[PDB]
Structure formats: C-alpha cells, structure tokens
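Submission sheet (multi-component)
Chains listed below:
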Amino acid sequence: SKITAAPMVYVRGEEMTAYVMDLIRSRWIEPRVDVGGWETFDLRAKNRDDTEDRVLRDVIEAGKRIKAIFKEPTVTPTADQVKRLGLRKSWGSPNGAMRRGWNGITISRDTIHIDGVELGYKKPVLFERHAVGGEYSAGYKNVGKGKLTTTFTPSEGPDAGKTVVVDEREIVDEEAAVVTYHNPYDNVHDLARFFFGRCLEAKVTPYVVTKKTVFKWQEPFWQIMRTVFDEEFKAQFVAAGVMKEGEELVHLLSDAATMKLVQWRQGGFGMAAHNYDGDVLTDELAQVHKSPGFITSNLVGVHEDGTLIKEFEASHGTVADMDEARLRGEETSLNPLGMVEGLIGAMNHAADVHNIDRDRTHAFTTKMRTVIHQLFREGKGTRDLCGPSGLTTEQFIDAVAERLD
Amino acid sequence: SKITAAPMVYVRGEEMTAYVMDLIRSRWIEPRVDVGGWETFDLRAKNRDDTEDRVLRDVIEAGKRIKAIFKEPTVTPTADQVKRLGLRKSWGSPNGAMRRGWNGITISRDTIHIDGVELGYKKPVLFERHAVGGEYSAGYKNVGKGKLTTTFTPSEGPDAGKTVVVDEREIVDEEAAVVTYHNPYDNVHDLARFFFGRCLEAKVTPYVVTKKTVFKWQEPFWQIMRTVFDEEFKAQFVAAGVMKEGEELVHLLSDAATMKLVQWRQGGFGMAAHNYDGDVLTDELAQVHKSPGFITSNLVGVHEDGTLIKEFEASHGTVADMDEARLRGEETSLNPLGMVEGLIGAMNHAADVHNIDRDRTHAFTTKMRTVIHQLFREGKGTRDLCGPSGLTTEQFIDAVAERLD
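Outcome: structure written.
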C-alpha cells in the first residue's frame, strides 16, 4: 500500500539542509513511499574529494538514464572550503557538468507561492534562463597593446572551407581584456516550445528579453521565439483567454525588463532571456518576491530519445550559519519549502517520464504542499514568515508529518 | 546687464521635450542670459536623415572644441521611426559616436533629489557606468557550423610580434552567434579617481560591481579600483565618517547588486560597473527611485589636451504621447527638472572651462534649481509629484519665470 516511487536520482549535500532533508525523507516520504527506485548519492564536499568526483560521474550517468533528479544544496569545494573541511584538493561547481551532461536548454526560475501568505508577486511568474552560451564559456586574455583577429571557417554550405574575418581591431590600451564567445541557438527552438507550453498551462503572458537593438547578434533568439509562438502557440493563447485577438508577442529590452520586474507586482507573466541576462534578472526577481529561497532553479535538458531530463534544486545554499547554531544547541527554523518544491518536481517528473504511479504520486506531492501552506496560514510555519511564534525546524517537520495521513 | 554665457554646445531634439525647452529658453534663460556663445544643433530624426548624419559629426567636433554639451532627449531614427516620420534611411543611436568621440570615461547616473519631497531612495545614490568597451563595440557574425579562431599579437614588450591563440572553438549549431569584444581598462584609473572623489564629497559608501568570479577578464576593473581606493581614498572615507577602520572596499557581484538596489531604499551608496552592467542596473535604479526622469545621464570624457569634455542629458525620452495630447489642445504636465539639471551642469562646466561670467552663471543656475525645488515644496510643481492639483507644463514654466528675478 505504499506509493511506488519512479526511478529518480537523489543528490545529498551536507550541513543544515542535509540534516533537514534526512528528517523529511525519514518522517514525510519513506513511511508513505517505497523509495527503492531512488538512486541516492552522497555529494558532501568530503565525498567528492574522497572519490575524486567519481560520485559526480555517477550522478550525471544516473541522470541521463533516469531523467529525473532532485539535488540538495551543496558546498562547492572552493579554496576557502579546502582548509575549512580538511580536504586534499579543490573541485569546481558541478553546474557546468550537469548542463552539458544533460543537454540543458533552460534553468527555470519561477516564483514559489503559498496559499494564504502574500509574497512580493501576487500571481505566479515564470522565467527561463537559457542554460548555455555567452560569456560563461568565453575564451579571453588580459593584454596590452596589439592586434586582435577573429576568423571563422564554415564546414558546410556554399562557403565551406573559406576562412572569413569576423573581427579585427587594434588594442590601444596598456591594460585590456579581449574576449570571444558564442551563443548556440539551435536549442532555442526547444526552449521556445518548452517556455510557451509552460506559460500557456500557467495562463501567464510570455515576454522575450534581449539587448538585440545594440547586441545585434542576439536577433535570432527573438526571431526563433517569435516564429515558434506565431506558428504554434498564439492561437492557443487567444483561445485560452491569456492574450487578446491581434496581440503580438512582446519583446522587452533587458534594461527595460529590470524595471518591469519591480513594477509588475501583480505577477502573472513569463520571461525568457539569454544565460547572463537570466542570471541577473532572476536574482532581481528573487529580491522582489522575497529572497532566493522562494525562486526555483530547475534545469531542463533534452534526452537523445526526445524526452526531457529535469533536475530540481532550491536556490539557497546549505545554510552553514544555521548548522553552526544547531551545533551550539540553539533553536533553528529552516523553511524547507524551496527544497520541498524541488523534491516535488523531481518526484512528479519521475512518475510522469516513466509512467509509474502517476495519480498517487501527484496526489501525495499535492498533499505535502497543501499541508505546508495550511500550516503557514495558521501561523505554524517557520519563523522567517510566521515570526518568533513560528515553529522550529524540527517542530515544523513533526507538524507536517502528523497532518500528511 | 545679461549674463554672458560661456561657449556651450546645445543639441535640440523634437516633440514634447523640444517644445518645453523652447519655452524655457524663451522665458527663463534669454531674458537673463546672452546665449550668443551657444552653438545649437538640430538633432531631429529628420535632420540626421536630411544631412546624411553630418549634423552628428558636427556635434562631436563642436563638443571637442567647446568641452561642454547639453543634449535634449532625441528620437533615434530606428526602422519604426523611419515609417512614422517619413524618413529615407534608418540611423543608429548617436550614443556610441559621442562616447567614443569624446574619449568617454563614465556615464554618471545619479538619483535626483528635492529637499522636502520623498522619492524611492531617501538619500543620494551615485552610479558610474564605464562609458566604453564591452559588447557595445563587439565584432560579430551569425553563422553555422565551423571553426572560430581568435589570435592576439602584442605590439610591445618582450613578446612583441609573436601571435598567440586567445581562443579556438568548433561551432556545432546550424544557428550560432560568434562575438569578439574588448574592455579598455587604462581609463578605469580615471574612472576610479572620479568615482571615489564624488562618493567622498557625497559621503556615500562606494561599491564596485562586476561578474569577475566567472568572467575572469574583469578582474582588473576590480584591482584598479581597489588599488586607487586603498592608496588615495580609504583614510579619507574613514575620516569622513563613511567607513570604519579595517573596513575594506566591497565588491558586489552584478547579480547581487540587482538585489541591493531593491533592498537599499535608504540610499546613501555608490556603485561603479562595466558598460552593460551599468546600463541594466541604472534602469533598475530609475524604477526604484521613481522613473527615468529622476536619474541623471552625464557623460564625462576627455580631450587630447586633458580638459574634461562633459555632456549632460535627461534620461527620459521626448514624450511623444504628451506631445500628441498637446497638439490636440489637451492639458499636459511635463516635469522639466531632469532636463534643467542637465542644462545646469552643462552651463556650469562651460563657465568653469572658459572662465566666462563664472560666478554669475553659478548663481543663476543655483537659482533655477532652488526656485524649482521650492515650487514642489509648495505643491506648485508638476502633476507627477504634486498629483492632480499640480501645475500644467505651461503654468509651471510661468511660475518659475516670475520667481527668477
């Protein structure tokens, strides 16, 4: 009579968030859900070091096969952490490996809402941060005076094999940065389809966000989006009452979009942007809404077989300060809602993409959310939203558990 | 005896803002000031088109010669404006030509304040947008599959004449952008001195804003600014009451800075950033403060001979909707403060550079500001800040005029 969990990758971190998720797994999930299909991985900074990222390899492989991943917040083993945690070596951020390993098209950064508690945006906002390209994968050098040349040699079509000059310039400064990057745009077709599909389901008005007026190479991000929308979605948006007859898809400049995020406190909109613009704008979105914990960070990629790989994370870290407080015998109140939304999304996608116990899984994950929201409504949520009379971390975990049935 | 205005470049626009400035010139300036020294340029979109942009060339040349420029809001001759205004050809924004032509250092984007009126930020905020470099001057191509190569050949030092590879990559998309740009950092030494001097005078806490953690070529923007601060300013900031001893200059990630602009409603801080980050963050600043009209846009560049070239502009547009209302005979209420702040700056700089009627010009510009600010304190400002009881455009101009003496 327990729910059969679909295959799903579970990535454990450390510190306060792992302490919390251990309690959630043991007291909310496991008594109601057979988690035999989960493949669990220990991603403590120490276990990455001890296995020399063998664990990360096993995460990415598991993710490609299973297509549904929940990842806890983790400690990136930076220089600071090597000394602190007593490790052998440093290890970089695992996001690049995940985005490439799973053919990432977007990080979905959506506002998280609680029925009965008003946050910054009244209604759901959706945001797609294009997951590849841009300055994140640039080649560069810091240089003095000299000549900079950029060439391109196509490998197919009429001009195949003929090298052309993209740019050439004389650097006249003693101190300068020289930078080259690319934006791969083939997966913007996939991105547009995913984005507009999401926006239609949510009944939110979509917007495309670039600096294409000046950064003219960005034009195709808009053109691909507009074409997909017009041909495959506009009729549907009008029919669903989301947009009026003759309303065109709107393009916003990135510097205008920063203003709109502050103005549009009603919510009820979607934005899609390039990698960096999405990075900056979604943290703005976090601040307007409440804080980073109330925005999702959901990586979506395209499997070779046509289905989607979906990884889900909370947007806060491991809350080391709170872990320290716990280890000083001081009361804590970690709001688990960001992580729970991630776990819900992963469990739902696991059930959906594998077609295993879908009705019962969706019902259960909906039930967890409903119970949590009702507790917050009553002033029995965590202290971030319910003040000093709110529940401690452990009190909140019990409160949910005894209402779950 | 009228004030003899120092030589100054005056760039006129069109629509509502030109109509307002025509009245201000007629009713405030000309009865008190001999403006024979002003060289005026017609930058109607139609005049850029009619002169094959020779007028923009003339503006740049006059700006170099005279060193002080006031520019009204203008209509960029975009494709859409070509249709609307019946032009022959489209023309790009004039910004790049001005910023590069006058050896741009910074665009200062400061909150505008009136004593006794509450806007978004309680205390002054200062922002320096690095005026040049970045994607604004990028070379690019939209391409398919192939090989992209970037090389650099230094012209001086021990590695002179030896070509090295900055980047090489294989493009695997049928649609991709390939982009190369440079950041010229020699003038960040000047940017830093300018920024910290202003912040010191204003007694605001300075911050440097970059994405250098990931975009590592940006590191010198930070290093240059920190070195100048530590060597030339830190002790002064301590003695001014702004910072404690042992407090260091703070670096903010650009995605953190977007959150701080929303949080820090008390104001009293400064930020300096690269060209694009500055563009995006200062529009956010405008929205938090009130609107674009309440943020300055003051370009500071430098002549070959060391004299600063200063151009001052309001940050709003020409307000076409209000101009249409005006021409229908309907009431309007355009707040001229943004434009007048710009004109004040340009007139003051002209007076200081040329040393023509310096003391009387400063008294007159101070008077315009005081008279304007006092009318707002009396509820006799425009309707943006004083509500429906506020004065019309024309009523406000006449109210100021009769108080100027």
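Remark: DSSP finds 15 helices and 16 strands in chain A.
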